[PDB]
Motif scaffolding. Structure first.
Motif, PDB file in Angstrom:
ATOM      1  N   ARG A  63       2.408  -3.515  12.027  1.00 26.09           N
ATOM      2  CA  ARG A  63       1.635  -2.999  13.159  1.00 26.09           C
ATOM      3  C   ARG A  63       1.340  -1.513  13.015  1.00 26.09           C
ATOM      4  NH1 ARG A  63      -1.061  -6.643  16.258  1.00 26.09           N
ATOM      5  NH2 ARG A  63      -0.866  -5.382  18.159  1.00 26.09           N
ATOM      6  N   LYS A  64       0.106  -1.136  13.343  1.00 21.76           N
ATOM      7  CA  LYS A  64      -0.327   0.261  13.326  1.00 21.76           C
ATOM      8  C   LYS A  64      -1.563   0.434  14.202  1.00 21.76           C
ATOM      9  CE  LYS A  64      -0.336   4.574  11.925  1.00 21.76           C
ATOM     10  NZ  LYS A  64      -1.301   4.969  10.858  1.00 21.76           N
ATOM     11  N   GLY A  65      -1.438   1.284  15.218  1.00 22.08           N
ATOM     12  CA  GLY A  65      -2.514   1.532  16.173  1.00 22.08           C
ATOM     13  C   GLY A  65      -3.013   0.272  16.855  1.00 22.08           C
ATOM     14  N   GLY A  66      -2.142  -0.732  16.956  1.00 23.13           N
ATOM     15  CA  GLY A  66      -2.479  -2.005  17.594  1.00 23.13           C
ATOM     16  C   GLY A  66      -3.084  -3.049  16.669  1.00 23.13           C
ATOM     17  N   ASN A  67      -3.162  -2.727  15.379  1.00 22.85           N
ATOM     18  CA  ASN A  67      -3.725  -3.626  14.381  1.00 22.85           C
ATOM     19  C   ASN A  67      -2.690  -4.075  13.361  1.00 22.85           C
ATOM     20  OD1 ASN A  67      -6.773  -3.773  14.868  1.00 22.85           O
ATOM     21  ND2 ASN A  67      -6.421  -1.559  14.902  1.00 22.85           N
ATOM     22  N   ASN A  68      -2.967  -5.195  12.701  1.00 19.74           N
ATOM     23  CA  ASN A  68      -2.136  -5.665  11.602  1.00 19.74           C
ATOM     24  C   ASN A  68      -2.682  -5.160  10.285  1.00 19.74           C
ATOM     25  OD1 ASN A  68      -0.749  -7.137  13.559  1.00 19.74           O
ATOM     26  ND2 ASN A  68      -1.887  -9.026  13.129  1.00 19.74           N
ATOM     27  N   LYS A  69      -1.844  -4.439   9.550  1.00 22.11           N
ATOM     28  CA  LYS A  69      -2.196  -3.910   8.243  1.00 22.11           C
ATOM     29  C   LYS A  69      -1.585  -4.788   7.157  1.00 22.11           C
ATOM     30  CE  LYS A  69      -3.850  -0.383  10.500  1.00 22.11           C
ATOM     31  NZ  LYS A  69      -5.324  -0.203  10.593  1.00 22.11           N
ATOM     32  N   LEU A  70      -2.409  -5.205   6.201  1.00 22.87           N
ATOM     33  CA  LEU A  70      -1.939  -6.014   5.086  1.00 22.87           C
ATOM     34  C   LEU A  70      -1.895  -5.181   3.811  1.00 22.87           C
ATOM     35  CD1 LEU A  70      -3.160  -8.156   7.255  1.00 22.87           C
ATOM     36  CD2 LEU A  70      -3.246  -9.705   5.298  1.00 22.87           C
ATOM     37  N   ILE A  71      -0.705  -5.095   3.217  1.00 22.36           N
ATOM     38  CA  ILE A  71      -0.529  -4.392   1.953  1.00 22.36           C
ATOM     39  C   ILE A  71       0.005  -5.359   0.908  1.00 22.36           C
ATOM     40  CG2 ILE A  71       0.202  -2.248   0.866  1.00 22.36           C
ATOM     41  CD1 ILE A  71       1.369  -1.520   3.747  1.00 22.36           C
ATOM     42  N   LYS A  72      -0.739  -5.489  -0.183  1.00 26.98           N
ATOM     43  CA  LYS A  72      -0.355  -6.359  -1.277  1.00 26.98           C
ATOM     44  C   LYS A  72       0.766  -5.722  -2.082  1.00 26.98           C
ATOM     45  CE  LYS A  72      -3.081  -9.380  -2.392  1.00 26.98           C
ATOM     46  NZ  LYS A  72      -3.382 -10.837  -2.404  1.00 26.98           N
ATOM     47  N   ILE A  73       1.742  -6.542  -2.461  1.00 28.81           N
ATOM     48  CA  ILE A  73       2.782  -6.138  -3.397  1.00 28.81           C
ATOM     49  C   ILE A  73       2.512  -6.837  -4.732  1.00 28.81           C
ATOM     50  CG2 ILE A  73       5.259  -6.092  -3.876  1.00 28.81           C
ATOM     51  CD1 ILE A  73       5.630  -6.230  -0.755  1.00 28.81           C
ATOM     52  N   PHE A  74       2.298  -6.035  -5.777  1.00 26.63           N
ATOM     53  CA  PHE A  74       1.980  -6.527  -7.121  1.00 26.63           C
ATOM     54  C   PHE A  74       3.227  -6.523  -7.992  1.00 26.63           C
ATOM     55  CE2 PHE A  74      -2.633  -6.686  -6.915  1.00 26.63           C
ATOM     56  CZ  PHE A  74      -2.940  -5.803  -5.891  1.00 26.63           C
ATOM     57  N   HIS A  75       3.214  -7.325  -9.061  1.00 28.71           N
ATOM     58  CA  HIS A  75       4.299  -7.337 -10.051  1.00 28.71           C
ATOM     59  C   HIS A  75       3.813  -7.291 -11.473  1.00 28.71           C
ATOM     60  CE1 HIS A  75       6.582  -9.717 -13.047  1.00 28.71           C
ATOM     61  NE2 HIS A  75       7.605  -8.929 -12.676  1.00 28.71           N
ATOM     62  N   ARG A  76       4.488  -6.490 -12.293  1.00 28.41           N
ATOM     63  CA  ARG A  76       4.259  -6.465 -13.734  1.00 28.41           C
ATOM     64  C   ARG A  76       5.525  -5.972 -14.428  1.00 28.41           C
ATOM     65  NH1 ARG A  76      -0.391  -7.230 -16.990  1.00 28.41           N
ATOM     66  NH2 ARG A  76      -0.436  -5.905 -18.870  1.00 28.41           N
ATOM     67  N   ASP A  77       6.040  -6.785 -15.349  1.00 28.66           N
ATOM     68  CA  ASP A  77       7.198  -6.429 -16.182  1.00 28.66           C
ATOM     69  C   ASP A  77       8.433  -5.952 -15.398  1.00 28.66           C
ATOM     70  OD1 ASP A  77       6.017  -7.102 -18.767  1.00 28.66           O
ATOM     71  OD2 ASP A  77       4.837  -5.256 -18.594  1.00 28.66           O
ATOM     72  N   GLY A  78       8.822  -6.732 -14.394  1.00 25.61           N
ATOM     73  CA  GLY A  78      10.036  -6.472 -13.624  1.00 25.61           C
ATOM     74  C   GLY A  78       9.927  -5.365 -12.594  1.00 25.61           C
ATOM     75  N   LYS A  79       8.709  -4.873 -12.369  1.00 27.27           N
ATOM     76  CA  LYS A  79       8.474  -3.788 -11.414  1.00 27.27           C
ATOM     77  C   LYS A  79       7.487  -4.192 -10.324  1.00 27.27           C
ATOM     78  CE  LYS A  79      11.355  -1.420 -13.598  1.00 27.27           C
ATOM     79  NZ  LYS A  79      12.657  -1.019 -12.994  1.00 27.27           N
ATOM     80  N   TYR A  80       7.740  -3.702  -9.111  1.00 27.24           N
ATOM     81  CA  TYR A  80       6.935  -4.025  -7.932  1.00 27.24           C
ATOM     82  C   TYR A  80       6.356  -2.759  -7.305  1.00 27.24           C
ATOM     83  CZ  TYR A  80       9.260  -8.575  -8.250  1.00 27.24           C
ATOM     84  OH  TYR A  80       9.743  -9.784  -8.695  1.00 27.24           O
ATOM     85  N   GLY A  81       5.256  -2.909  -6.571  1.00 23.86           N
ATOM     86  CA  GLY A  81       4.616  -1.780  -5.903  1.00 23.86           C
ATOM     87  C   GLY A  81       3.239  -2.094  -5.353  1.00 23.86           C
ATOM     88  N   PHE A  82       2.681  -1.135  -4.621  1.00 27.83           N
ATOM     89  CA  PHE A  82       1.391  -1.304  -3.957  1.00 27.83           C
ATOM     90  C   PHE A  82       0.213  -1.027  -4.888  1.00 27.83           C
ATOM     91  CE2 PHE A  82       3.952   0.362  -0.139  1.00 27.83           C
ATOM     92  CZ  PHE A  82       4.435  -0.907   0.151  1.00 27.83           C
ATOM     93  N   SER A  83       0.457  -0.206  -5.906  1.00 30.40           N
ATOM     94  CA  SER A  83      -0.559   0.170  -6.884  1.00 30.40           C
ATOM     95  C   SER A  83       0.089   0.719  -8.153  1.00 30.40           C
ATOM     96  CB  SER A  83      -1.510   1.220  -6.296  1.00 30.40           C
ATOM     97  OG  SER A  83      -0.798   2.375  -5.882  1.00 30.40           O
ATOM     98  N   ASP A  84      -0.715   0.874  -9.201  1.00 32.01           N
ATOM     99  CA  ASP A  84      -0.275   1.535 -10.421  1.00 32.01           C
ATOM    100  C   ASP A  84       0.128   2.985 -10.138  1.00 32.01           C
ATOM    101  OD1 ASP A  84      -0.695  -0.717 -12.100  1.00 32.01           O
ATOM    102  OD2 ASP A  84      -2.827  -0.219 -12.266  1.00 32.01           O
ATOM    103  N   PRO A  85       1.318   3.400 -10.616  1.00 28.86           N
ATOM    104  CA  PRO A  85       2.277   2.596 -11.377  1.00 28.86           C
ATOM    105  C   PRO A  85       3.285   1.854 -10.495  1.00 28.86           C
ATOM    106  CG  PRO A  85       2.996   4.864 -11.353  1.00 28.86           C
ATOM    107  CD  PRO A  85       1.780   4.794 -10.463  1.00 28.86           C
TER     108      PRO A  85
END
Ligand SMILES: Nc1cc(O)cc(-c2nc(N3CCOCC3)c3oc4ncccc4c3n2)c1
Lengths: 991, 277
Positions: free
Chosen positions: B52-74
């Motif tokens: 929740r943020k400012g009354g809205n639902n925010k969707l953030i993708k979590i990516f995976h590559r080679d045992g590491k996770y995050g929203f973007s490179d790196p």
């Protein structure tokens, strides 16, 4: 009723007569009697009463009286029946008429069609309303000029528009039914003195224009008749008011195209051009008698004062506190955090507090709305419930920011809505003043404050930039992926930032505009300004995709402007007819009375009478609804003033429907504890009357205006078994060639059930059929006529020669054996094919839409073997809430009875080549609709403000996303379908 | 302790639930409320964080590559639990300075454990039957009140227009007094000096009849005014009763749904759930 209080007036009725010399005379009359005989009866007795000497001739006087609609009405048509006068009370005032008679007659004819008196618009203070009435006339008279670009051929094109497809290109299986691409067509001609017909069988190319069909007809000096008398005649459908007037390939006309698939021969009729051209009314048009700081200069955050509410209807015992919930909305999404008032006791609803919003006033987008509601409250576990709601446009129709004190009369919460605010609901105060009234105060900024002009916006959009690269293949591929998401698949924040960064490259893929618009920060004038410049020069898009931009998620006028301009350029009258229901409902989302979409639809309705017909009826059916009364009424008023002669035809339809509403009312209230034998007797006794016979005969079918409804076959009309008492009506087809199409027209008139859900279900089915047909899948559906004509009042087309499954069954082989009798011999295979194809379509269609569970009464079969469904009632699984499970039903399960038919009576009915052949049809049908998922999601999205409980939110439309498996891959979507069918058929799916 | 737990045991981890289920758990919740679900299979990414943020639902993708996770490179996080717990203590401004908030309130999948601590399947099922029956009952009670309501609203509409039609009638019958007054002023005058009382006898008779007719009409709308006041009062009463059932309805539905969730998260047969419901 025909009188006030009493539904039907007695045969004898005393009338009070108010004379111009101030005398009151009682007169004995008949309920059938006309105004001419009343007036002659009156002055016959008025000679007895005092001061008769002062009375003039009867030709100098007229009757005036008050009506059921509280309107003082002067009766010019003195050949009207007393029961048809629509009197509030049995009194008549005789006075001398003054003023413009012509426009008075016209005003009462609009008023009658419209459902309300036109003079109720005169006493509306609101400037927006009176501006709409005047400014819309420019559209109206501008529309009648397109009706005169090539008179009187323009008049014919208007009244009888070509009923064509969108494309001249024919699908493969249609062409493969033609003999080397040629169609056998029968043209009939009359010799009326002898009054008999001579048939001429022709064999011409499918793509022949009516002129090539008119040339060959004469043969059945060789080229002289086709040189002079070529454009001297016109073609007509037998048993129809459907004409071929424009240069289209013959096969592109719906009737001809229908004949090929059905295997029926096209029966056309030769007729003189002048014979219809002089029969046309040639209706003329008359003008009616009713013919500073910038927002970005205000250095202040938004704040609104909630003063007090007059009252809420709440029990002090049960509720602890009441409060006011508030939000600043752009469409369905908040522009900042919602702000509540402090909690107060139920008894005294008074707040007097300035609420503060996290929004700088310059950042308010043009379509910004105030959404509010009075809510109630009940560790500390507490329930919040809406008591009443209301929405306010922060800018008026002239771009002015609201200011100072104002009062907002609130609305009842729609059934089923639990949301504390209602951003989708209409804006404006409840016309009903006896209603919870919230009083609020907006800031006043020492001026009329106006939203900036486009040129001012463009300069800021340039400034925002002032404060080179190519598009990589990587980026080009993600842009394609984003654009393939369906209209309800929320884009991520990474995707939003991606799309925005690449907004200048997004133009290369024009269909991504809906996603780019969701990536805009609407609470930022910097970003909205930059969006506007991009929108202005944006490449036009396919109408089906433009409609996406007309739902309640896209309120911005520039965006909507764009969408409408796409429809102006690319929407053909065929597809416009197909989507008219949604385009009308979507008017409910529009902030203002005057907008580009309403100008588009009205123009279309005033230049094409087929569109006009349904435009009128869709609007009229919702006139009872106070959320839309004023808007649609005003819209209907404009249409009825500019449509010309068709108003007289619409009046007869309305007059017929009202009398059916009258009769069914009486049956449901006054005759409830009577048997059906007597109820029917009442119906006949009341239908036999001359006023009912003249009303219910010789009018056009509101289900299809091309179908004239002549004489009633009163002996064959019946009340149906249901408690709402549906009327199974039967009319003669009065066409002089009706035997070749249909001799009689049957319609079910229902008064008590909401038929809007069925109306939508049948529209969707029709569209699904169109998809399958063009993609080479011959799955014949049966989307019969269904039209909602008022509040739970509607019309259902009757399919000839159709029987319910229970009728056949009343052993699990009797269905297959029944079909065998009706299709005996070698024609048996054409039946099993049609049944299997029908079954597949309806199996897939009902699963996708989640319509109410099917049974023997829900499912019907025709003689030829075509299977179809009736009484859909609820869709999108409305029986899932109020229940527990969050799974997807399979409404139409194939019992062994159906499986035998498909298997032609084989032993292993799930292990035949015919059953697997049937399975692949269901797989093909399923994926075909999935590929067009956006269209269906869009259509549903336009229906959220409609008032249908089955779709009040985007969460309801989420059902088809789950049945069409949109969050999955195409392989997984098929696998999902297979599993649902297997679970429903207890494994009998031979996977 | 926390960083070493499985993603599977994470309270904020819901697995294969749809975006629409996520919406129904995030409706009208304070900023910072969050949960993680699997990403939709036809897309890049493994998980979707929703907050929740400012009354809205925010969707953030979590990516995976080679045992590491995050929203973007790196990608710099060793696990999803590591990623989430980081932003329960740090502001998301570190990733995006426009969405400045922390992940404060997890939508726990052990939510119903608070309401229902009953460990027995059949006891939870039988209480599901009781809460459902109560809910269905109140749903039908509310339904009848809605039929009454709409019918009452429609009959009030008819009466309101009938009042206006009565007023119009009274106007016409009063203007009829005006016309008879303006016409007889000189015609009674002529026979006041001519002494013709026999004619006056039947002119006054007519006028008294007109006055007599007005009385009835005014009385009839006076009666309709009383009916309307009575029916408007019924309307407000029906509305009060409905406003008492509504809160009880939401609670009865919420309790049933959470009791349905406990049995689903224990995997009770889809057929035995329907025998309770
Ligand atoms: N609420 C509703 C809605 C609807 O779309 C269709 C019908 C409907 N349509 C019918 N049609 C539709 C066209 O085919 C012929 C009759 C029906 O026939 C019946 N016979 C016996 C009992 C009931 C019916 C029946 N009901 C009823």
């Amino acid at each position: 009723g025909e009188l006030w209080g009493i539904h039907l007036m007695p045969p004898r009725i005393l009338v009070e007569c108010l004379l111009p010399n101030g005398m009151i005379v009682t007169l004995e009359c008949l309920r059938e009697a006309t105004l001419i005989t009343i007036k002659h009866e009156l002055f016959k007795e008025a000679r007895k009463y005092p001061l008769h000497q002062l009375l003039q001739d009867e030709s100098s006087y007229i009757f005036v009286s008050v009506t059921q609609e509280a309107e003082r009405e002067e009766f010019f048509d003195e050949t009207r029946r007393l029961c048809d006068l629509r009197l509030f009370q049995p009194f008549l005032k005789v006075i001398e008429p003054v003023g413009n008679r012509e426009e008075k007659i016209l005003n009462r004819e609009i008023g009658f069609a419209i459902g309300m008196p036109v003079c109720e618009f005169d006493m509306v203070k609101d400037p927006e309303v009176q501006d709409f009435r005047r400014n819309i006339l420019n559209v109206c008279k501008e529309a009648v000029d397109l009706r005169d670009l090539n008179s009187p051929h323009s008049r014919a094109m208007y009244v009888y528009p070509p009923n064509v497809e969108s494309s001249p290109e024919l699908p493969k299986h249609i062409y493969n039914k033609l003999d080397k691409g040629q169609i056998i067509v029968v043209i009939w001609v009359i010799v009326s003195p002898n009054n008999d017909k001579q048939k001429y069988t022709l064999k011409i190319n499918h793509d022949c224009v009516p002129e090539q069909v008119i040339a060959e007809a004469i043969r059945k000096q060789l080229k002289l008749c086709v040189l002079e008398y070529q454009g001297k005649y016109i073609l007509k459908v037998c048993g129809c008011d459907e004409y071929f007037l424009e240069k289209y390939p013959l096969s592109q006309y719906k009737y001809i195209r229908s004949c090929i698939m059905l295997g029926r021969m096209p029966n056309l009729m030769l007729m003189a051009k002048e014979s219809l051209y002089s029969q046309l009314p040639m209706d003329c048009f008359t003008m009616p008698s009713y013919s500073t700081k910038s927002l970005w200069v205000i250095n202040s955050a938004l704040r609104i004062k909630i003063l007090c509410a007059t009252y809420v209807n709440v029990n002090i015992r049960d509720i602890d506190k009441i409060y006011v919930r508030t939000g600043i909305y752009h469409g369905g999404e908040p522009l900042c955090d919602n702000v509540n008032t402090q909690r107060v006791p139920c008894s005294n609803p008074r707040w007097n507090e300035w609420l503060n919003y996290d929004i700088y006033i310059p950042d308010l987008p043009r379509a910004a709305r105030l959404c509010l509601s009075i809510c109630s409250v009940k560790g500390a576990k507490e329930e919040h419930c809406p008591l009443a709601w209301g929405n306010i446009n922060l800018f008026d129709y002239t771009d002015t920011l609201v200011s100072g004190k104002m009062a907002l009369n609130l609305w009842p919460v729609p059934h089923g809505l639990e949301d504390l605010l209602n951003p989708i609901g209409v804006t404006g105060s409840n016309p009903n003043k006896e209603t919870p009234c919230l009083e609020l105060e907006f800031d006043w900024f020492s001026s009329v404050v106006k939203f900036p002009d486009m040129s001012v916006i463009e300069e800021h959009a340039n400034w925002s930039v002032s404060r080179d690269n190519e598009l990589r293949e990587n980026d080009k591929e993600q842009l394609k992926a984003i654009s393939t998401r369906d209209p309800l698949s929320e884009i991520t924040e990474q995707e939003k930032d991606f799309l925005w960064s690449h907004r200048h490259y997004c133009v290369t893929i024009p269909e991504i505009l809906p996603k780019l618009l969701l990536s805009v920060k609407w609470n930022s004038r910097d970003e909205v300004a930059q969006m506007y410049c991009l929108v202005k020069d944006w490449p036009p898009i396919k109408p089906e995709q433009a409609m996406e931009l007309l739902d309640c998620n896209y309120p911005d006028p520039m965006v909507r402007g764009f969408a409408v301009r796409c429809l102006e350029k690319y929407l053909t009258d065929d597809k416009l007819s197909q989507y008219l229901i949604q385009l009308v409902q979507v008017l409910k989302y529009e902030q203002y009375l005057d907008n580009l979409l309403v100008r588009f639809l009205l123009k279309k309705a005033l230049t094409n009478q087929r569109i006009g017909h349904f435009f009128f009826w869709h609007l009229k059916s919702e006139m009872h609804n106070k959320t839309v009364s004023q808007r649609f009424g005003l819209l209907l008023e404009s249409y009825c003033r500019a449509c010309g002669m068709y108003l007289k035809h619409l009046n007869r339809q309305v007059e017929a429907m009202e009398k059916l509403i009258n009769l069914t009312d009486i049956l449901k209230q006054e005759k409830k504890d009577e048997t059906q034998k007597v109820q029917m007797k009442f119906l006949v006794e009341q239908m036999r009357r001359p006023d009912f016979m003249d009303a219910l005969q010789g009018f056009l079918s509101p289900l299809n205006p091309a179908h004239q409804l002549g004489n009633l076959r009163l002996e064959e009309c019946r009340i149906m078994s249901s408690a709402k008492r549906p009327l199974w009506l039967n009319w003669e087809n009065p066409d002089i060639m009706s035997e070749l199409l249909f001799q009689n027209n049957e319609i079910i008139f229902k008064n008590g059930d909401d038929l809007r859900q069925d109306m939508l279900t049948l529209q969707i089915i029709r569209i699904m059929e169109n998809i399958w047909q063009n993609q080479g899948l011959d799955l014949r559906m049966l989307p019969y006529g269904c039209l909602s004509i008022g509040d739970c009042v509607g019309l259902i087309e009757v399919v000839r020669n159709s029987h319910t499954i229970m009728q056949i069954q009343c052993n699990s082989h009797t269905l297959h054996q029944w079909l065998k009798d009706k299709n005996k011999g070698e024609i048996y295979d054409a039946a099993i094919d049609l049944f299997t194809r029908s079954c597949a379509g309806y199996c897939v269609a009902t699963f996708i839409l989640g319509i109410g569970d099917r049974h023997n009464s829900n499912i019907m079969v025709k003689d030829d073997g075509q299977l179809f469904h009736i009484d859909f009632g609820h869709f999108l699984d409305h029986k899932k809430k109020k229940f527990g499970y969050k799974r997807e039903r399979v409404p139409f399960v194939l019992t062994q009875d159906f499986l035998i038919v498909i298997s032609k009576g084989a032993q292993e009915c799930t292990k035949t080549r015919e059953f697997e052949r049937f399975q692949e049809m269901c797989y093909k049908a399923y994926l075909a609709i999935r590929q067009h998922a956006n269209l269906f999601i869009n259509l549903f999205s336009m229906m959220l403000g409609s008032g249908m409980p089955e779709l009040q939110s985007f969460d309801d439309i989420a059902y088809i996303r789950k049945t069409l498996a949109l969050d999955k891959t195409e392989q997984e979507a098929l696998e999902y379908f297979m599993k649902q069918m297997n679970d429903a058929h207890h494994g009998g799916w031979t996977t | 302790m926390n960083n070493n737990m499985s993603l599977q045991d994470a309270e904020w981890y819901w697995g294969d639930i749809s975006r629409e289920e996520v919406n129904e758990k995030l409706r009208d919740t304070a900023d910072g409320t969050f949960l993680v679900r699997d990403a939709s299979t036809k897309m890049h990414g493994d998980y979707t964080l929703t907050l929740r943020k400012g009354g809205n639902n925010k969707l953030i993708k979590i990516f995976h590559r080679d045992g590491k996770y995050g929203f973007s490179d790196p990608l710099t996080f060793s696990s999803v639990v590591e990623l989430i717990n980081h932003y329960r203590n740090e502001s998301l401004a570190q990733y995006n300075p426009k969405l400045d908030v922390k992940l404060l309130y997890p939508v726990s999948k052990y939510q119903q454990d608070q309401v229902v601590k009953e460990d027995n399947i059949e006891a939870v099922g039988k209480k599901l039957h009781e809460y459902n029956t109560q809910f269905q009952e109140k749903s039908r009670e509310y339904d009848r009140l809605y039929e009454e309501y709409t019918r009452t609203s429609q009959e009030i509409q008819m009466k309101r227009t009938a009042i206006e039609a009565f007023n119009e009638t009274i106007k016409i019958f009063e203007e009829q007094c005006q016309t008879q007054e303006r016409y007889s002023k000189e015609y009674i005058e002529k026979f006041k000096r001519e002494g013709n009382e026999k004619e006056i006898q039947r002119i006054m008779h007519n006028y008294d009849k007109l006055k007599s007719r007005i009385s009835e009409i005014i009385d009839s709308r006076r009666r309709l005014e009383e009916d309307l006041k009575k029916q408007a009062a019924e309307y407000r009463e029906i509305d009060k009763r409905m406003n008492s059932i509504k809160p009880d309805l939401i609670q009865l539905r919420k309790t049933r749904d959470q009791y349905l969730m406990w049995l689903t998260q224990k995997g009770v047969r889809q057929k035995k759930l329907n025998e309770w419901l």
